[PDB]
Amino acid sequence: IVNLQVEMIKQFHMQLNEMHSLLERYSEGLVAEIERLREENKRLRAHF
Amino acid sequence: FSFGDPCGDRFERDTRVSLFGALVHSRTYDMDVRLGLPPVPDNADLSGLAIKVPPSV
């Protein structure tokens, strides 16, 4: 039971860290979109 | 009876899109374009004003 508990705690910790990492990965795009639209508007204004 | 469209000669084409070289950073075939300049870069207050180097292409 003690071995099971220790292994379970380690696995829980690892799984928590993996879930945190996955949420961080799945939750820069906005900045790039803003930059692209700014570039597009500046190009439009200069061309006009 | 028209100023012929400068579609043929590259020199004439550039003259037309530059308005006989009047346009600096823009080219246009539209006669009704509202002329605008490129916006002031956001980093100008942070990085200063750089001399825009024309792209080599």
Curated annotation (Swiss-Prot), chain A:
Tell me the compartments it is located in. Answer: Cytoplasm, Cytoskeleton, Microtubule organizing center, Centrosome
Q: How is it modified after translation?
A: Phosphorylated NEDD1 can interact with gamma-tubulin for targeting the gamma-tubulin ring complex (gTuRC) to the centrosome, an important step for spindle formation.
The modified positions for Phosphoserine read S27
List the cysteine pairs that form cystine.
none
* Record's subunit section: Interacts with FAM29A. Interacts with HSPA1A and HSPA1B. Interacts with gamma-tubulin in a HSPA1A/B-dependent manner.
This chain's function reads: Required for mitosis progression. Promotes the nucleation of microtubules from the spindle.
Q: What is this protein called?
A: Protein NEDD1
Q: Which organism is it from?
A: Homo sapiens (Human)
**Gene name of the record:** NEDD1
Region of the whole protein represented = 611 to 660 of 660
